[PDB]
Design a protein around this nucleic acid. Sequence first.
DNA 1: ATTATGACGCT
DNA 2: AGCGTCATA
Length: 430
Amino acid sequence: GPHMATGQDRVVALVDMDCFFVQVEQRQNPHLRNKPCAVVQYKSWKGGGIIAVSYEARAFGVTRSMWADDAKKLCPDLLLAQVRESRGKANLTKYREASVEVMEIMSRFAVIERASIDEAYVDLTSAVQERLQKLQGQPISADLLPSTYIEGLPQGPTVQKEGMRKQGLFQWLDSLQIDNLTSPDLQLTVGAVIVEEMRAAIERETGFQCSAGISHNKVLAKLACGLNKPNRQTLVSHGSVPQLFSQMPIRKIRSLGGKLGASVIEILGIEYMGELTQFTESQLQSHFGEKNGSWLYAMCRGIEHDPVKPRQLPKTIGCSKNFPGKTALATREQVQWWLLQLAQELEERLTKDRNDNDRVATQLVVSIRVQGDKRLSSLRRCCALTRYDAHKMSHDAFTVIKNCNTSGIQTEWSPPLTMLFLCATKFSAS
DNA sequence: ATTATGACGCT
DNA sequence: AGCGTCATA
Ligand SMILES: [Ca+2]
Ligand SMILES: [Mg+2]
Ligand SMILES: [Mg+2]
């Protein structure tokens, strides 16, 4: 009772750009704004692979991973923007730079952990205390929360969505105890006020819209964020957890979307996150290991302790290309030419990295896939990375993988390579 | 013939 | 170290 920690110690947000690559392209080309549109890479094979989709286009059933030709069957007027190509491969620089724009804005408000090219966790705990002292027991106006949903509300005794949103928000605010600087619900609420401000600043200064989740930890924040998209934010309180989890498929929780989540369902014979509460910590540990077992026991109760790491910059810089089906590399000349193209992009990105961020990578990781293997990577090998020179890097990469060539002939390569990957890692200050 | 990434766990 | 898992545009 009095000694059970409830995982209400922090306020954590997760900010996620809406259809991010699409917005980057729409900002640049106003003709694409407010239309069904998608971003595609390459174009010759089935019109190109779709990697991002506007909300207008999703309404027609267009999705990521769909071939553009097939998307056009669902959405004939679908508009397309193509990822830039350089050195014969997709080049994602425009999106990486747009991401930096957003991350630098977020960093003005609080410490952020860059979770992906378009999302960051924010630890608001400190910022909330501060704001709480400026407010001095002042109630929080619904006006300060114009895009916020309160998960689980309204309840009890509204035909249209904005009306529901507001009814829910009013119930929440009318119940709030602002007299108490340590109420976790109040802290979450102040968190949401800050996130409205952050989101306003991002949109003002970049033109990009985003959604966000505000809760007591990263898993709940991430889940919350997806509840109302696009261009909205969702507060998931500790109290909302039991109802929310009672019908929440296990696979929806971050880290449970793959094989572990599949085994939780299979081994325990359950479907929903809430059903986990009926097992002891020991039981969960026996099936899923000490760490996972402990994590699951706490998580199904809405509790998680993973910190927002103070890290705004990626830890690795990598360049990758697939060579699918008939394009698999089958000669030594080919392999060396593409290792060079990858190495040239990598050098360019590394040099800029060193200038902007005062660090140097020290390890080069080389990875390939061979025709047949259904794994992302067939083989990984690292070497020293002593100079930012593409010719040297490609030469070193060739050296570490060349023994993979089955071909008895020097000039031929077998089995053919269907993927090449160069990654710079292990940065040190400079 | 989704592709191009990126973080982190296990042994 | 090299491999696997899980994630996102
Ligand atoms: Ca997004
Ligand atoms: Mg995202
Ligand atoms: Mg997405």
